[PDB]
């Protein structure tokens, strides 16, 4: 009873009518019958319905319809590229059936609210994916499918047509093909790969222009801030060597015992840290 | 290579599974399969094979030894450690597991760990030999106090004259003659008049003989003998012989008395 | 001043013995000592199960306990009244189960039931802006002339910790 859901599926209305079938469909993964839920998300929306059984969601920690993580809204291949691939799960036939069975007993014996072993891992995060995690609901995802009479030029329902009248996606784009099983296991997922390419460009971690340099060239200081903000932020890292301050261009230089600590302060800092409700931007030299 | 090797693996692998499914048990099939994957250094597969075999028959001690061995061969110390713990937990009576477990820890250098294991082992009140091995373990390091402590527990767990004698002898070997004497006193005190015989009393006599307390030896020999059963007959004879020897170490009066 | 684990005022990163300063994600499951005593090596066996469920492992468990007298409150049959309670609760629970089984033999649900949900995503832009939502659950009507939808016959091998056992001359051989 009650599905497991994204906030993005469930709807942008707080009031929702949602129907239930006892054994509605096989799950497209572990292939068992399971309680299925439909509901209307919104005014122009599509009537989504749960695609996979609740168990294999608890297993990989995901929405039932979307298969996007609960916290990050990221396809599974991504958050695995983000932490731990070694979760695994047999893809192969009768194994899948077997492992699902056992893991279904293991889950039965848990407190109920926890994605099994992954959650022991799931706490430690934020490497990148937080910064590539999506922020707001994305409703373009629930729109009705593309009317396929109209996309041949004919559709004779006129304005009534609940489907959507517009140009489809060119089958050329590798982002088209998108199997379900595939998106689930984290194989060759085009979306996930795209997000990976997007991850790399994040100006961030390579640093190291020069050896031993712990000099921090800090842009976007501002004249509200004091140094004491700086120190009481940065004593976490280690033994400071010193701090140079310039308020004429509002840039603050810093120096630490080891370069390692400076890299760190970059990492922890870059395009993340803000104090005095004002962004504190960092660069090398 | 790339594909050609692969096909080979399917034929073997599939065959192994077929054999297992046909016979179910007959764990020589399980083991051979495990060994083959081990040889290809696919040890994650190997682990699963061993666990599956254990599900079929957890009592089979060869299986467990092969499993732990496999982990050790691949330097997977902590896996092996886990496995050993399981083996002794589920089949505590199997001494082979305990001997190997302590040996492994000793090789790793973890004396404390090994001691801990042996203390667990001793809770099962095992067998004379196990206790000896624990004591010897201690004696590979100086640790004489530890050894003596173990003996103190051991001679009560298996209160056999012989063990008491052995304990005393241990003290003698390390020159704690004061304590050795005390141990003999304790032994005779404990056993009491009710049951004691030849061996212990002889050994005590020998001890005092070596301590050069000849008069005392005679006192002990006589007084303790008269205090108890005497004659059994064989034991008595042995004792008499010992006494004679001690004496040696007009005076053939009992030669005539025994004959007459 | 020390700069080593050996040796708040310091204003230094110091980690005194062995608190880890870099990610490891180590497998090891914490060794434990309980109250006065023992490294809880029996924790191996429980591992799969919950703390609640019992499992014998130490030698002490195996060793005999004596006597207990002609009788003591220690061994007795819960009582009349405990039995009545147990029996009654059992009876009702079984009956529920049986009725479900019996549903097959005897081939109608009308409840509208509302639920109130708290999400776990929140963030104030996720809903219109509500910490909760409400969902009216309705059971879908089944077509009575619909055949069994999907196929159950498929068969998958029985799943797999053993309790400790705690239990020859050449000529005999």
């Amino acid at each position: 009873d009650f599905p497991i859901l994204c906030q993005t599926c469930l709807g942008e209305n707080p009031y929702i009518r949602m129907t239930k079938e006892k054994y509605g469909k096989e799950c497209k993964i572990c292939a068992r019958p399971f309680t299925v839920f439909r509901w209307c998300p919104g005014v122009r929306m599509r009537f989504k319905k749960t695609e996979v059984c609740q168990t294999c969601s608890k297993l990989k920690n995901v929405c039932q319809t979307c298969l996007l993580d609960l916290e990050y809204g990221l396809p599974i291949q991504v958050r695995d590229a983000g932490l731990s691939f070694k979760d695994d799960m047999p893809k192969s036939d009768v194994n899948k059936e077997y492992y699902t069975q056992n893991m279904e007993r293991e889950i039965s014996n848990s407190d109920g609210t926890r994605p099994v072993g992954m959650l022991g891992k799931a706490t430690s995060t934020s490497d990148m994916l937080l910064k590539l995690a999506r922020t707001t609901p994305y409703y373009k995802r629930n729109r009705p499918h593309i009317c396929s009479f109209w996309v041949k030029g004919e559709c004779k329902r006129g304005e009534e047509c609940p489907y959507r009248h517009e140009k489809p996606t060119d089958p050329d784009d590798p982002l088209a093909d998108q199997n379900i099983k595939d998106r689930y296991y984290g194989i060759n997922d085009p979306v996930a790969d795209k997000l990976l390419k997007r991850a790399s460009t994040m100006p961030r971690l390579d640093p190291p222009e020069d050896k031993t340099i712990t000099t921090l060239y800090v842009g976007g200081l501002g004249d509200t801030i004091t140094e004491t903000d700086l120190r009481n932020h940065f004593y976490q890292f280690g033994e400071i060597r010193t701090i140079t301050v310039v308020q004429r261009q509002q840039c603050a230089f810093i120096q630490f015992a080891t370069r390692q600590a400076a890299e760190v302060a970059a990492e922890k800092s870059f395009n993340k840290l803000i104090v005095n409700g004002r962004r504190l931007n960092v660069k090398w030299g | 290579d790339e594909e050609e090797l692969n096909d080979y693996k399917l034929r073997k692998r599939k065959t192994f599974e077929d054999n297992i499914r046909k016979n179910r048990t007959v764990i020589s099939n399980w083991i051979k399969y495990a060994q083959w994957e081990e040889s290809l250094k696919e040890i994650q597969r190997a682990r699963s094979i061993y666990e599956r075999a254990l599900d079929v028959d957890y009592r089979n001690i060869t299986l467990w030894l092969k499993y732990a061995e496999m982990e050790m061969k691949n330097r997977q110390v902590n896996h092996a450690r886990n496995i050993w713990d399981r083996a002794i937990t589920t089949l505590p009576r199997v001494n082979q597991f305990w001997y190997k477990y302590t040996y492994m820890e000793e090789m790793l250098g973890n004396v404390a760990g090994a001691r801990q294991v042996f203390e667990r082992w001793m809770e099962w009140q095992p067998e004379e030999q196990a206790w000896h091995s624990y004591i010897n373990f201690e004696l590979r390091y100086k640790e004489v106090d530890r050894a003596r402590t173990i003996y103190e527990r051991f001679v009560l767990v298996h209160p056999d004259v012989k063990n008491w004698i052995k304990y005393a002898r241990f003290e003698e070997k390390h020159a704690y003659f004061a304590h050795a004497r005390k141990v003999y006193e304790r032994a005779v005190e404990f056993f009491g008049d009710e049951h004691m015989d030849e061996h212990l009393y002889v050994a005590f006599a020998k001890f005092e003989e070596n301590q050069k307390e000849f008069e005392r030896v005679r006192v002990i020999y006589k007084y303790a003998l008269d205090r108890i059963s005497k004659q059994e007959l064989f034991k008595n004879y042995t004792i008499f012989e010992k006494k004679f020897g001690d004496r040696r170490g007009k005076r053939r009066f009992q030669y005539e008395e025994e004959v007459k | 001043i020390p700069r080593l684990l050996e040796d708040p005022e310091i204003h230094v990163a110091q980690y005194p013995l062995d608190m880890g300063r870099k990610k490891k994600m180590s497998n090891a499951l914490a060794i434990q000592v309980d109250s006065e005593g023992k490294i809880k090596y029996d924790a191996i066996a429980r591992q799969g199960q919950s703390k609640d469920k019992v499992i014998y492992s130490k030698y002490t468990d195996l060793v005999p306990k004596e006597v207990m007298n002609a009788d003591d409150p220690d061994l007795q049959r819960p009582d009349e009244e405990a039995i009545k309670e147990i029996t009654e609760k059992t009876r009702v629970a079984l009956e529920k189960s049986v009725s479900q089984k019996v549903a097959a033999a005897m081939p109608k649900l009308a409840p509208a039931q509302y639920i109130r949900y708290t999400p776990s995503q929140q963030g104030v832009a996720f809903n219109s802006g509500a910490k909760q939502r409400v969902i009216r659950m309705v059971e879908m009507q089944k077509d009575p002339m619909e055949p069994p939808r999907f196929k159950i016959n498929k068969k998958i091998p029985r799943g797999p910790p053993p309790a400790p056992v705690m239990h020859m001359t050449v000529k005999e051989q």
Partner: peptide, 29 residues
């Protein structure tokens, strides 16, 4: 058919015990 040569038939990842198995990996043939 692929329950063998593609994907490890049924997998039991070994249970993890008081020691570190993170580091360990093995060589090819």
């Amino acid at each position: 058919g692929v329950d063998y040569n593609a994907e490890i038939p049924f997998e039991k990842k070994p249970a993890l015990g008081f020691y570190d198995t993170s580091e360990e990996n093995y060589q090819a043939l």
